[PDB]
Amino acid sequence: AKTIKITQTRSAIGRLPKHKATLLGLGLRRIGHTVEREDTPAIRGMINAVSFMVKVEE
Amino acid sequence: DKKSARIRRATRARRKLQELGATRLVVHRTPRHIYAQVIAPNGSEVLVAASTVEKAIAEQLKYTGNKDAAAAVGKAVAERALEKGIKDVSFDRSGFQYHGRVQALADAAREAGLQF
Amino acid sequence: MFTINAEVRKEQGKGASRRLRAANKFPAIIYGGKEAPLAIELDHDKVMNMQAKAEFYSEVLTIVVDGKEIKVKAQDVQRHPYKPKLQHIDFVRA
Amino acid sequence: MLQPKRTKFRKMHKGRNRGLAQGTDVSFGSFGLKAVGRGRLTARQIEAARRAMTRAVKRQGKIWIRVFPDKPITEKPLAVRMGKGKGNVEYWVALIQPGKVLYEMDGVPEELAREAFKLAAAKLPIKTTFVTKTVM
Amino acid sequence: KAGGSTRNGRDSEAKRLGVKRFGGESVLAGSIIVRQRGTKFHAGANVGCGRDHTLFAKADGKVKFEVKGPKNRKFISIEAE
RNA sequence: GUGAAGAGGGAAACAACCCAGACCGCCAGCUAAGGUCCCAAAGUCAUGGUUAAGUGGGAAACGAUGUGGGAAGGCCCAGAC
RNA sequence: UCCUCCUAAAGAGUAACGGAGGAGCACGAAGGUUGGCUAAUCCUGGUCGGACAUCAGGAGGUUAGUGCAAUGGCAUAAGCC
RNA sequence: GCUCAACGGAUAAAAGGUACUCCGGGGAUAACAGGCUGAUACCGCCCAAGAGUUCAUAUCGACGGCGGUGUUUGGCACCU
RNA sequence: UGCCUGGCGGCCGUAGCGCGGUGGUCCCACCUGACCCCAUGCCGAACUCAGAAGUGAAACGCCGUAGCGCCGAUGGUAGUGUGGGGUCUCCCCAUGCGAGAGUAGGGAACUGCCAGGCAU
Ligand SMILES: [Mg+2]
Ligand SMILES: [Mg+2]
Ligand SMILES: [Mg+2]
Ligand SMILES: [Mg+2]
Ligand SMILES: [Mg+2]
Ligand SMILES: [Mg+2]
Ligand SMILES: [Mg+2]
Ligand SMILES: [Mg+2]
Ligand SMILES: [Mg+2]
Ligand SMILES: [Mg+2]
Ligand SMILES: [Mg+2]
Ligand SMILES: [Mg+2]
Ligand SMILES: [Mg+2]
Ligand SMILES: [Mg+2]
Ligand SMILES: [Mg+2]
Ligand SMILES: [Mg+2]
Ligand SMILES: [Mg+2]
Ligand SMILES: [Mg+2]
Ligand SMILES: [Mg+2]
Ligand SMILES: [Mg+2]
Ligand SMILES: [Mg+2]
Ligand SMILES: [Mg+2]
Ligand SMILES: [Mg+2]
Ligand SMILES: [Mg+2]
Ligand SMILES: [Mg+2]
Ligand SMILES: [Mg+2]
Ligand SMILES: [Mg+2]
Ligand SMILES: [Mg+2]
Ligand SMILES: [Mg+2]
Ligand SMILES: [Mg+2]
Ligand SMILES: [Mg+2]
Ligand SMILES: [Mg+2]
């Protein structure tokens, strides 16, 4: 119900700790990892925060 | 000037009773009249009031601004306060000296039954 | 008389204003009176030529937006700090 | 050579020189010498460009100096190791942002102000330009 | 070419002042809210002022920052909780 | 943040830079930075311009009818330069 | 060794043989409480009396004061009788 | 009752020399040289007030400005 | 319910100054007197008491007034979080936040409880 696909497209090696925690909150683990999350403003805020290294499919 | 220095002279004990939450008897003194009012601890509403400007008090008196009028006022405001169930207050001199008409008022209210 | 052609800004802010001054334009605003303020954009080389005269800053100017003439006056202008260019102009409805 | 008479403190941090300037418009006179680059102007560079335009106008017209050197600059002496306190105050500078009007001038023609400010800008490390009094 | 010194080597220890409990933050009675030198803040309802102008809670509840008075001074009060 | 304690690919080579985190094996595929004339894997790809300096492929104040584009101006078939 | 400000990057904290200043006490009242009061400076007039004593008025409104360094406070005065 | 002030105070109680020297270690740390840098130095250049009978630029060039080299005096302490 | 005044607040300058006007039945203020209660490091000035002949001069209150003070958009600019980039002492791009100053303009407060007076 209003769920979207989020796909990690870049690495998280040199990234900030807050961005690594945001990717953990989305549940992304490795590159090309496509995950399925609900569409809330909190989810959209994490995607906004790491939009450079994810790809939202909706 | 004189009004302002009286307010500066009163505004320490007024703020102290403001934070004590004290129901407070407020005296106001003129050369001709003397005023009294019992104020709630919020300071925004009154409970009872008495004066020498009222007819029921002034018509029994010689002059409205002597010690006998001030004692009649403190008696009337105490009997109205005890009618309304207000017994314990704190006396606000309102920047006057506790002396003369103010003291005779507070002694009348103590004698009529208020406790301060 | 100076007749200036303008267009209503579809978007505002810093990125838009930088991007207009990139594309040889500059924003302005018409305000005053009871009407709401109107966020316009002008051609830079035209208005930069028109402002060299003191008539520009004295007379009443006609601004055409959507074929709708608005008689204004030049209230204030923000200039580039070291280039002969215009950042932004305030127009008060006369 | 311009220099403050008194100072609240004798020395100052090195700081930075980022940002745009404030003395942008030609306030007092008719013609102006506007800074385009960024940097610091010493009191010697200011007084040399003042001499070059005072002589180029034959004391005709009036010349304003919009800047003032108020930042002390320290240097350590030669063959002194890097510790043991901050260096000694040697000279005074004025921090210059782009857009700062450095000088103003009136009472002279435009072409004379061009050749005077050109003789002055040849004494200055930063790149300048010529400006006039704009209405508004 | 050896020489120099520095008459300016001193400094004192950091006293760890500031606001210990912020707004909307439930405290116990006696909890230190603010340590400060002067009365940069002032004591409101259910808030005592210490010997060193320290603001402590006289009761339990939430901290309320508010601006009152003609001088626009900043008061700290404890809301009930 | 990386190295330290981290290999791999690129930056000619180049701990700390860019991409990216090596369980093992495969004569399988897709990609990152960076690249596609030969050394040396992949476009002598397409379309439209600029440069003539080997600029690219090292550097300033300043200087100069180099050349491309744009907006305006003042003289001018009552004859301009 | 201790205190104050800056460096210190708007919570705390944060270094250098970095920039500037102080302390190693005092007070039996300079503490407590009640009551009351409100400065600096300048102007005018005025015996000795003068730039400047004291006195009266006026502007001002804390630019003063705080036992001592600086900072933060202080009119409900924490200042003064 | 301690200027134990070297102020978390080695003891109640303590200054120096070694080119007559010695041991353990360090390129964690100096002198030589190299390296980085280029303040300084040196070599150029820009403007041109003037000097040069007149005449800024034959030769010089004040006040000031921009670079180059790595060449002096130095800075750092990366190798030993 | 209307007007006016006094007291106590709320709020803390859109509420404050200034300028002009205006008020006295009541109230308030000044006032009259002081041997007394009480008071002056002298003084009934203040504090206090006993009063009410006079006056609204001052103060205070009210009304008006934009010389200020104050408030204050819209747009833009500065800055900046993240990511990227350059000619990297400093800037640019995408995106998010977004001032200060200034401008137009606003603006000569609003409101609660009690008591009294005159009208209604
Ligand atoms: Mg941006
Ligand atoms: Mg590696
Ligand atoms: Mg390689
Ligand atoms: Mg590598
Ligand atoms: Mg390489
Ligand atoms: Mg492929
Ligand atoms: Mg690619
Ligand atoms: Mg090949
Ligand atoms: Mg801090
Ligand atoms: Mg911080
Ligand atoms: Mg004391
Ligand atoms: Mg008191
Ligand atoms: Mg005198
Ligand atoms: Mg010791
Ligand atoms: Mg120790
Ligand atoms: Mg040995
Ligand atoms: Mg070493
Ligand atoms: Mg060496
Ligand atoms: Mg060099
Ligand atoms: Mg040099
Ligand atoms: Mg000659
Ligand atoms: Mg020469
Ligand atoms: Mg030169
Ligand atoms: Mg080191
Ligand atoms: Mg070597
Ligand atoms: Mg009036
Ligand atoms: Mg009297
Ligand atoms: Mg009057
Ligand atoms: Mg804005
Ligand atoms: Mg603003
Ligand atoms: Mg006002
Ligand atoms: Mg008024």
From Swiss-Prot, chain C:
InterPro entries linked: Rbsml_bL25/Gln-tRNA_synth_N, Ribosomal_bL25/Gln-tRNA_synth, Ribosomal_bL25_short, Ribosomal_L25_dom, Ribosomal_uL5_bac-type
Cellular component per GO, a single term: cytosol
Keywords: Ribonucleoprotein, Ribosomal protein, RNA-binding, rRNA-binding
UniProt cross-references to Gene3D superfamilies, sorted A to Z: Ribosomal Protein L25, Chain P
Pfam families: Ribosomal_L25p
Functional summary from the UniProt entry: This is one of the proteins that binds to the 5S RNA in the ribosome where it forms part of the central protuberance. Binds to the 5S rRNA independently of L5 and L18. Not required for binding of the 5S rRNA/L5/L18 subcomplex to 23S rRNA.
Sequence similarity: Belongs to the bacterial ribosomal protein bL25 family.
Listed name of the protein: Large ribosomal subunit protein bL25
Provenance organism: Escherichia coli (strain K12)
Higher taxonomy: Bacteria, Pseudomonadati, Pseudomonadota, Gammaproteobacteria, Enterobacterales
UniProtKB/Swiss-Prot annotation, chain D:
Record GO terms (molecular function): rRNA binding; structural constituent of ribosome; tRNA binding
Domain of life, per lineage: Bacteria
GO biological process: one example: ribosomal large subunit assembly
PTM summary: Is hydroxylated on Arg-81 by RoxA. The modification is nearly suppressed when E.coli is grown in anoxia.
Protein biosynthesis among keywords: no
Membrane spanning stretches: none
PROSITE patterns xrefs: RIBOSOMAL_L16_1, RIBOSOMAL_L16_2
UniProt keyword Nucleotide-binding present: no
Location of N-methylmethionine modifications: 1
Modified residue annotations for (3R)-3-hydroxyarginine: 81
Any one cellular-component term (Gene Ontology): cytosolic large ribosomal subunit
Pfam families membership: Ribosomal_L16
Keywords: Hydroxylation, Methylation, Ribonucleoprotein, Ribosomal protein, RNA-binding, rRNA-binding, tRNA-binding
Family matches, as InterPro entries: Ribosomal_uL16, Ribosomal_uL16_bact-type, Ribosomal_uL16_CS, Ribosomal_uL16_dom, Ribosomal_uL16_sf
Functional note: Binds directly to 23S ribosomal RNA and is located at the A site of the peptidyltransferase center. It contacts the A and P site tRNAs. One of the last ribosomal proteins to be assembled in the 50S subunit. The simultaneous presence of uL16 and bL36 probably triggers ObgE's GTPase activity and eventual dissociation from the mature 50S ribosmal subunit. It has an essential role in subunit assembly.
Entry's family note: Belongs to the universal ribosomal protein uL16 family.
Subunit structure: Part of the 50S ribosomal subunit. Cross-links to the A and P site tRNAs. Interacts with assembly factor DarP(YjgA).
Protein name (database record): Large ribosomal subunit protein uL16
Organism for this UniProt entry: Escherichia coli (strain K12)
